[PDB]
Amino acid sequence: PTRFKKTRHQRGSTFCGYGRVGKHRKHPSGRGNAGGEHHHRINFRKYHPGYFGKCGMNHYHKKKNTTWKPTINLDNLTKLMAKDEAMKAKKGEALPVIDLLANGYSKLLGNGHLQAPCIVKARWVSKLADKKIRKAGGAVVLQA
């Protein structure tokens, strides 16, 4: 809304908050990111230290669909099951089966304390996730 702007407060002040000595002029320091190495060096070095220069190898025709790999931790496995199933199964009983591809996940990382045993189907798995799920009474079935 125009009625909330500072322009409404400045009607009658003749300068609009820009001063009498150094006025409001057009581009007193250049346009855009000009002079980033000459008269704006301190600002660039202080806040954007990695702006100038190159780093690493190149990759033509990236095709981001080939590197799709979402991850989920062992601590969040309960959110993929029904509420009753979390407390229904333990150790030697029949365990729920979780398929990670249907829910949109690829790799199973093992972080935190596992709540309930289960059978998880995944494309990739971790060293720690494999050991923790096996001790708790579950298993991992590899997918494709």
Partner 1 sequence: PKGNNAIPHVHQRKHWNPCSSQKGNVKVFFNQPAQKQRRRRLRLLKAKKIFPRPLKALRPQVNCPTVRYNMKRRLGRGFSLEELKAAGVKPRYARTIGIRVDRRRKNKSEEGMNINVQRLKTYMSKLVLFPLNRKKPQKGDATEEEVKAATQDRSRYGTAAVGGLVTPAREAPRKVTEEESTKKMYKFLKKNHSAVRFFRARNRRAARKE
Partner 2 sequence: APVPRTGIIAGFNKGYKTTRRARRPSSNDRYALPHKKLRAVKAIISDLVGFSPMERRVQELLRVGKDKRALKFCKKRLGSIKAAKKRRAKVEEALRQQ
Partner RNA sequence: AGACCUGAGUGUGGCAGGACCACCCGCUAAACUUAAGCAUAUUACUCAGCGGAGGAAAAGAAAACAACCGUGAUUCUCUCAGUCAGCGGCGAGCGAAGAGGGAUUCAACUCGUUGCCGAAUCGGGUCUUAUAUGACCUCGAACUGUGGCA
Partner RNA sequence: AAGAGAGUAGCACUGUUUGGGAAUGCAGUGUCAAGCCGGCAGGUAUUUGUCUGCCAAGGUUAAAUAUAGAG
**What residues from 79 to 108 belong to the interface with partner 1 (CB under 8 A)?**
89, 92-97, 99, 101-102
The CB-of-58 to Mg ion minimum distance in angstroms stands at 21
Q: Per rule CB under 8 A, is residue 87 in the interface with partner 2?
A: no
Q: Which residue is nearest to Mg ion (CB)?
A: 17
Does 17 belong to an annotated binding site?
yes
33 vs 143, which CB is nearer to partner 2?
Answer: 143
With CB under 8 A as the contact rule, the residue among 99, 123, 137, 139 that binds partner 2 is 123
**3-state DSSP call for residue 43?**
helix
For residue 31, what are the contacts with CB-CB under 8 A and spacing of at least 6? none
**3-state DSSP call for residue 46?**
helix
Nearest in space to 138 (alpha carbons), one of 121, 126, 124, 123? 121
53 vs 104, which CB is nearer to partner 2?
Answer: 104
The 3-class SS string of 100-137 reads HHHHCCCEEECCCCCCCCCEEEECEECHHHHHHHHHHC
> CA angle 7-11-15, nearest 5°?
80
Q: Per rule CB under 8 A, is residue 114 in the interface with partner 1?
A: no
- Residues 86, 78 contacting (CB under 8 angstroms): yes
**Residue 17 site contact among partner 1, Mg ion, RNA, none (CB < 5 to 8 Å, cut-off depends on kind):** Mg ion
- Residues 74, 110 contacting (CB under 8 angstroms): yes
How many residues touch partner 2 under the rule CB under 8 A: the total is 5
Q: Per rule CB under 8 A, is residue 74 in the interface with partner 1?
A: no
Q: Per rule CB under 8 A, is residue 4 in the interface with partner 1?
A: no
The CB-of-39 to RNA minimum distance in angstroms stands at 5
